[PDB]
Amino acid sequence: MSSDPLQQVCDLIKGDLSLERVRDIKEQLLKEKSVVEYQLNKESDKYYGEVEESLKLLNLSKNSVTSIKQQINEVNKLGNDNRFAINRYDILFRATKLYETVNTTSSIYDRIYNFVALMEHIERLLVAELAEDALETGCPHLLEIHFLLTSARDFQEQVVVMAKEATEDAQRTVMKLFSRLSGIISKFDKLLDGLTYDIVEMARAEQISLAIRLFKIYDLEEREDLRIEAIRNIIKKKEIEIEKSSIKKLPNSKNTARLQDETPKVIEYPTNKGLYQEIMSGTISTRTAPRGYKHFLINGINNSISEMFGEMREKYVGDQKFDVLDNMDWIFNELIIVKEHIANCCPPHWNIFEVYFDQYYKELHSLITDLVESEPETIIILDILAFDKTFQDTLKQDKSVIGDKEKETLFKDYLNLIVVKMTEWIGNLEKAEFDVFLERSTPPHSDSDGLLFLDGTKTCFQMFTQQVEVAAGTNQAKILVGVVERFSDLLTKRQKNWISKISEEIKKQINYNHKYDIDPESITPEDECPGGLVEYLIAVSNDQMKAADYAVAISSKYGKLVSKVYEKQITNHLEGTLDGFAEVAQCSSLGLITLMFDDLRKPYQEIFSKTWYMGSQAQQIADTLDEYLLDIKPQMNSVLFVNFIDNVIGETIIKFLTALSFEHSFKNKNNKFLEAMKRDFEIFYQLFVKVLDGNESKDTLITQNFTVMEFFMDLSCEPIDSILDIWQKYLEVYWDSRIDLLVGILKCRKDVSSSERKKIVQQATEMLHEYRRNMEADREPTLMRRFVLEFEKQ
Amino acid sequence: MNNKSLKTVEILKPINQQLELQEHLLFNNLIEEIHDIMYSKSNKTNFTR
């Protein structure tokens, strides 16, 4: 098969004739079919039982439900038994003679249409009672619902005026219509003056334990009675749409009609084809239809009386800047009290519990406009509406709260504010600091061993720690990252300015040392600047490490209530900066190494000439720079220090190998240069091992440079047949300084000639490049990185 | 049935199959022409008459 030949490959992953591994491979197939039949077993069982209940209930309802509608053949065909038999008496004279006077409702319509005129003219004040509450009307379950039933007796002139639509006469709704002017709208609007003044009376801060009880009881009685009443009229168009649109829209008319059907199919003709589905008989039977807006259409004015009192309590200024939700959420507390008080009053309607969430539309929509733009206090924009979001949540079910959706755009306003503010802050703090550091007689914040902290950087520390209190205070993935990481771009502008003006500190000590001991024909205006750059630039690296303290240590110290993704998005650009927290040391402290130097450039090129060969130039270099690392040594930050003295032994050996191209013929002749490589090697040893005390770097960060010491002793002292292996070994560590240095060494030498430079130094050039294909495919550029000295014609 | 077609083990079973079958026609006509009695015995040549 197309699987089996592939399965012949799967078992042909056992060999070709592999009967033991064919057996085991068959056991693997048995494991696969084993579990596939466990899950296919139980799954097939569940499907089978689903078919079992499926056909079991298709059975049970085919038979039993066929005997449920056929049990309606049993009991409903039993309904047809006593159709013209029952009630053992003159039922024919009960439904056609005693019920003939049921078609004789004349005098009740005259004294009740007339009494509906006069007494509801009286109930236009009595059942429309107000001024002020006295329990809301007084007693609007007596009063406003007396206007509801007086409007339900005038629902003969309001709802059964729509049932009596040309029943038998013309003045049943005309001469009684002036009896319905003071009859219907002096009872229905009396129930709506008592209903709008009931719910308005229920909008009156208590409101009350009997006023909202009676008033809301009328506004649930005539509210839900109105709901089933107009639901019985809409179910007279839906029971007529069920009934007359099963008659007119059978379809067997089949025109259908013009124009009392489609439209109004199906209503369809009042009294009684359009009425008796809401009228007699009809054990209701009007439908009621009181009161329409007791709270059937007037419960929206209660939750919109706390959501129009709430929305009215905004006072859109916001009366300090965001006090809209103060009085508005106060009306939300009155919405919870009026809500639960009214559900204690009225179960069916009249503000059961919707006043709370309607007032959450009042506080939500209210707080989403007081700080829509930056028109409120932009520093206090999201804290107010968010404080009412979570607090007005916690003041309720959490839920008459302030849903805002403008939190995050206002957090972009906090982005622009805190970021551009910290551009202003950071710029002033920088230029203040650097203009302090050019005053080189007093160091910053006191300690006598150069571990000084700073002042404006402390304002960055503590005061930017206070800038991110809204960041961590609201736990934003867009500010506590974004102000922090855009702030890290601001820190990149910082360390660029520490490179710039700390390089101007370097220039200041360069020409101040020109003023000190370096031939004073160099003097600049801003460089009147003696020794003392040590405490300044190390004070910088110290608050690089204290930017590690509050930036790194506060960073991972507080930010622990997101996942490590967003916490990590913070962590990408505050704590890799530890490398950055010596990267200024990549630019400051190398300047320190040259400013240990710049009082001493008179021996720095008189090396390789005859003065240093038997004199005290090595004394000045080694001992003076030794003391220069006998005062930076107490005064230096550690991460700056290891890299520092590392680059002191390195840079001081390349200032010990400065003058390899001055072409002074080497005094290995009478050993004057050679003692300058050997006896001065003792003097240039405690420049490595008295510079370094308190640690064991004395040769450890000097061994790599004893390579260029001893192999350079093999380069520049030794004769013809001992400069080959000089470039062998010196190639085996330092190919960064290339072969042509030896050419300069044979520029500084007569008694190893230029054809010897061809054989030794050019076959050794082939050693250099072919070993660079061989062994470098030695180590990095170093102190001897780009000191490939000039070569002649090989 | 399984053809199979090819190596792994079938084919390179079928060599010893078909040559084992001509080996059984070899031993078959050996015992057939043994006491055919084209060699005479009870057997080919173990004389019992």
UniProtKB/Swiss-Prot annotation, chain A:
Cellular location(s): Cytoplasm
GO MF terms held by the record: SNARE binding
InterPro entries in alphabetical order: EXOC3/Sec6, EXOC3/Sec6_C
GO cellular component terms, semicolon-separated: cellular bud neck; cellular bud tip; exocyst; mating projection tip; prospore membrane
N-acetylserine: modified positions: S2
GO biological process: exocyst localization; exocytosis; Golgi to plasma membrane transport; negative regulation of SNARE complex assembly; protein transport; vesicle docking involved in exocytosis
Pfam families linked: Sec6
Keyword set, alphabetical order: Acetylation, Cytoplasm, Exocytosis, Protein transport, Transport
Family: Belongs to the SEC6 family.
Note: Present with 1080 molecules/cell in log phase SD medium.
Role according to the record: Component of the exocyst complex involved in the docking of exocytic vesicles with fusion sites on the plasma membrane.
Quaternary assembly: The exocyst complex is composed of SEC3, SEC5, SEC6, SEC8, SEC10, SEC15, EXO70 and EXO84.
Protein name: Exocyst complex component SEC6
Organism: Saccharomyces cerevisiae (strain ATCC 204508 / S288c) (Baker's yeast)
Lineage: Eukaryota, Fungi, Dikarya, Ascomycota, Saccharomycotina
UniProtKB/Swiss-Prot annotation, chain B:
Top-level taxonomic group: Eukaryota
Entry's localization field: Cytoplasm; Cell membrane
Subunit organization: The exocyst complex is composed of SEC3, SEC5, SEC6, SEC8, SEC10, SEC15, EXO70 and EXO84.
Functional description taken from the UniProt entry: Component of the exocyst complex involved in the docking of exocytic vesicles with fusion sites on the plasma membrane.
Family: Belongs to the SEC8 family.
Name the UniProt record assigns to this protein: Exocyst complex component SEC8
Gene behind the chain: SEC8
Residues of the whole record sequence present: 195 to 243 of 1065
